[PDB]
């Protein structure tokens, strides 16, 4: 409210008369004549902390963390567990970096680009998305958001020759250019591992755009793909190694309960 | 009102401040508004470039900043005079003119005179109906592109000398030192007084 409840001339009654010391409106005549005026307590009152439009809405994240968090969101789209444990159904699909050739971008009628998704068996996920066409739980249904929708795969490309048309009608799908990616659409809900369909002209650029550890990237100036704090990361292959089990004390497996 | 160790603070909110505040909820709306006024202006005019005229080379005012080069205001006539073009002809050709700018060096003067003729080298004009008074043939075989960008002849060009390597000689390694400054400063605040003490010897008579 810009100025709510203060658009009223009122005052405390002051003296006795067995009333509380809240400000009362003036006058006579009508109903609203001696009632409790402004204050968070009263009906028709200015709320406590009338909110200001200069709340710090927008937040900063420095660029290297935005690039650390998107290296970490594409590699989870490669592991066959994390992209199933998020909810995408890659059960009957081939190799997890799905890369189709550049001929996909010459699709210009969506009868064609659906039986692309059927022949790759990626239609086992869109068949799930039609099931999730529910309605919103709460009071969002009057703020013109009414239909919840489980996000589907994302086709990531470059050099559009019509593929933005023949995929923008399929529900739950997302199309994002491999030049200009987006962390918000590669991890819906902050849960890593969205399933992605690539393209040859898209999938090859990432060696020259995020770089490797051997060199840097050529389409970003001062970036190198970040370091990996664990070289050998499976400790079950480590803790069952002869360097360690030469060094250990012994296990100690009696229970030694409470003796009466 | 203050407690254990902290800054002492003068926060300037004693004055009324909530009736003049300026949230920038339109600064995305003002960025893509003033990109329409660069899209629909640079195409509307001409094969003339965007980003305005040719600016000259200008060296900065502060001791802090005199070591560097800046896109100035206009070639101040003299550069239009040594290079020899008319002043009211210059600002329709595409050359900025700033008449209240002076030149008190010959080093900086020729630094723009070559720059102006270099601009006049890389200029092609369109004569009206092709009788061609003092413009050549078909339009430099074609205009080769529509608009130029971010300045005509890259106005920064903060160039620097190589100065590769040298042999230290006898004179260079013995003299030029710190004591050449303490006596240099001593001829800055003990110079006018020593003009006055020699007047003492001309009145000793």
């Amino acid at each position: 409210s810009e100025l709510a409840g203060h658009q009223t001339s009122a005052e405390s009654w002051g003296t006795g008369r067995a009333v509380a010391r809240i400000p009362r409106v003036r006058g006579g005549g009508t109903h609203r004549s001696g009632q409790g005026a402004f204050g968070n307590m009263c009906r028709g009152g200015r709320m406590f902390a009338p909110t200001k439009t200069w709340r710090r809405w927008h937040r900063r994240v420095n660029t290297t963390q935005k690039r650390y968090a998107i290296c970490s969101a594409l590699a989870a789209s490669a592991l066959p567990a994390l992209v199933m444990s998020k909810g995408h159904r890659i059960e009957e699909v081939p190799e997890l970096p799905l890369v189709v050739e550049d001929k996909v971008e010459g699709y210009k009628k969506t009868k064609e680009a659906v039986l692309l998704l059927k022949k790759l068996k990626a239609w086992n996920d869109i068949k799930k998305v039609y099931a999730s066409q529910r309605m919103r739980a709460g009071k969002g249904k009057m703020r013109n958001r009414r239909r919840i929708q489980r996000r589907g795969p994302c086709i990531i490309y470059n050099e559009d020759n019509g593929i933005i048309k023949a995929f923008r009608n399929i529900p739950g799908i997302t199309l994002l250019n491999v030049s200009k990616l987006n962390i918000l659409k590669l991890a819906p809900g902050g849960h890593v591992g969205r399933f992605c369909i690539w393209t040859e002209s898209a999938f090859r650029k990432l060696d020259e755009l995020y770089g490797t550890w051997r060199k840097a990237a050529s389409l970003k100036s001062n970036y190198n793909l970040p370091m990996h704090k664990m070289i050998n990361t499976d400790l079950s292959r480590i803790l069952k190694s002869p360097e360690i089990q030469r060094a250990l004390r012994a296990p100690r497996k009696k229970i030694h309960r409470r003796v009466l | 009102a203050p407690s254990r160790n902290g800054m002492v603070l003068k926060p300037h909110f004693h004055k009324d401040w909530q009736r003049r505040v300026a949230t920038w909820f339109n600064q995305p709306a003002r960025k893509i508004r003033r990109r329409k006024a660069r899209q629909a202006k640079a195409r509307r005019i001409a094969p003339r470039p965007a980003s305005g005229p040719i600016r000259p080379i200008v060296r900065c005012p502060t001791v802090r900043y005199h070591t560097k080069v800046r896109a100035g205001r206009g070639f101040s006539l003299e550069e239009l005079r040594v290079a020899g073009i008319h002043k009211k002809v210059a600002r329709t050709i595409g050359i900025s003119v700033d008449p209240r700018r002076r030149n008190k060096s010959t080093e900086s003067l020729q630094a723009n005179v070559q720059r102006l003729k270099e601009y006049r080298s890389k200029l092609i004009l369109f004569p009206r109906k092709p009788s061609a008074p003092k413009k050549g043939d078909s339009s430099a075989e074609e205009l080769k592109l529509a608009t130029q960008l971010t300045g005509p002849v890259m106005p920064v060009r903060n160039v620097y000398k190589k100065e590769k390597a040298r042999v230290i000689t006898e004179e260079e390694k013995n003299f030029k030192a710190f004591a050449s400054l303490r006596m240099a400063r001593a001829n800055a605040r003990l110079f006018g007084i020593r003009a006055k003490r020699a007047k003492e010897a001309a009145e000793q008579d």
Partner: protein
Amino acid sequence: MKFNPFVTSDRSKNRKRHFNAPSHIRRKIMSSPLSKELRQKYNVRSMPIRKDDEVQVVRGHYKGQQIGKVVQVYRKKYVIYIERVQREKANGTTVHVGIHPSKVVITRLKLDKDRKKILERKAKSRQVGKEKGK
């Protein structure tokens, strides 16, 4: 998916343009489909309805196979009245009941000179899209 910015998407505003709609725009939103045969002779999909068209009623309490003309088109209350479908009151008086014309099938049109210019222009402009695919 809507890309045109200068038209709405909000529930609380398309209702305000619907319930407070002017009464010649109101005949456009009260439009009924043509029958399965009659959309193939006149090769046009659907029409705004009028006062002397006989059509069967498809979805309601009164369903199917009772072709009989309409009698009165309340535009204000989004309701047409058809001569067959009625209701006995508690008096014993019979009055019509109302059925929204998007739950109603035209099975014969009335034609005049003003409708021929509608059934031509709405039919020409479907073989425009068919000749987009040259």
